[PDB]
Design a protein around this nucleic acid. Structure first.
Ligand SMILES: [Ca+2]
Length: 342
DNA sequence: GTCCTTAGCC
DNA sequence: GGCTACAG
């Protein structure tokens, strides 16, 4: 009882550039966010399987990427192109079950309990999903099928890319015992290391250790949740994610601490955040500053009414002003985030 | 329900 | 780098 079907687009951004650009078949492809500063200032957002065999990965500096593969194909992120392709697949997804939780620009969880009898009909539903998506958008996905959200995700990780994998109630048990902890959704590097010292290498170890000695560390929320996976008791429903804050953040030319030159960046993040809102009026604004050393500093302000675009303008300067005088360091990035919509 | 600094994700 | 939620 309770069948969750999970869908993750493989090397999404790079795959979309491949479908668009037949001249990139075969070779390696590295989609980057270019800073606008120096030559190859920036970071990597994704790489195809061919790029990833060589270490080139999401998050490393572009400069480093080019140390490894000086001649992969390097491409600027075109966020709104993957956004179009993404919403088109999300809609195809939406036809198979009303109960859909969109989790990022490239993964979605389907609850299929009323639409199939057991896993055998699911895995088939899985194949239909895949093929229909590849037909209409020429994009390969991976399908994960399990008893809850988290093991749906894990199942897709084991069969990525282009593929499909079921994890029945039994295999849940093996993975509770013998699967590596960092491979648990919502657990990457920093929290592996938070436990890598601690003696915990698999989910089970968490039951073999005191509760507060975990609570205190990675934090109560994270401790509870993992313990729930250990006990095989996770049962979080599939609900429509609602976007809580929409924002923009842009890197400046020559990072500085003069308000009059910082000002025009600040205002562009505002236009584009309004752009985004889309008929949504927030009550809250935060001015976000990234410093010369890269130590994020944020000041906001909540209003009992919604914030007009113009009030967003003047109000931002006041919050910018506050930062300029409580943190001492120069400013490299500047932005705004809007939240608590009407 | 409010000011703020903290990790997993493409 | 840019995004967004999450942690008390
Ligand atoms: Ca994903």
């Amino acid at each position: 009882s309770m069948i969750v079907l999970f869908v993750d687009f493989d090397y999404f951004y790079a795959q979309v550039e491949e479908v668009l650009n037949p001249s990139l078949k075969g070779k390696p492809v590295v989609v980057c966010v270019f800073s606008g500063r120096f030559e190859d200032s920036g970071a990597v957002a994704t790489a195809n399987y061919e790029a990833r065999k060589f270490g080139v990965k999401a998050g490393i500096p572009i400069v480093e990427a080019k140390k490894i593969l000086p001649n992969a194909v390097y491409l600027p992120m075109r966020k709104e192109v993957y956004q179009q392709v993404s919403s088109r697949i999300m809609n195809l997804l939406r036809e198979y079950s009303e109960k859909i939780e969109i989790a990022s620009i490239d993964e979605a969880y389907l609850d299929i309990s009323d639409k199939v009898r057991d896993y055998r009909e699911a895995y088939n539903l899985g194949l239909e999903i895949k093929n229909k998506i590849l037909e209409k958008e020429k994009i390969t996905v991976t399908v994960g099928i399990s008893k809850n959200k988290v093991f749906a995700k894990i199942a897709a990780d084991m069969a990525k890319p282009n593929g499909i994998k079921v994890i029945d109630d039994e295999e849940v048990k093996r993975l509770i015992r013998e699967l590596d902890i960092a491979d648990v959704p919502g657990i990457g590097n920093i929290t592996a290391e938070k436990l890598k010292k601690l003696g915990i290498n698999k989910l089970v170890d968490t039951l073999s250790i005191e509760f507060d000695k975990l609570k205190g560390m990675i934090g109560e929320a994270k401790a509870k949740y993992l313990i729930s996976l250990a006990r095989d008791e996770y049962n979080e429903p599939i609900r429509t994610r609602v976007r809580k804050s929409i924002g923009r953040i842009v890197t400046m030319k020559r990072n500085s601490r003069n308000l009059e030159e910082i000002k025009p960046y600040l205002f562009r993040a505002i236009e584009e955040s309004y752009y985004k809102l889309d008929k949504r009026i927030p009550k809250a604004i935060h001015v976000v500053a990234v410093t010369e050393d890269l130590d994020i500093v944020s000041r906001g302000r909540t209003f009992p009414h919604g914030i007009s675009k113009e009030t967003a303008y003047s109000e931002s300067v006041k919050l910018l002003q506050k930062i300029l005088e409580e943190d001492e360091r120069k400013i490299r990035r500047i932005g705004v985030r809007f939240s608590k919509f009407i």
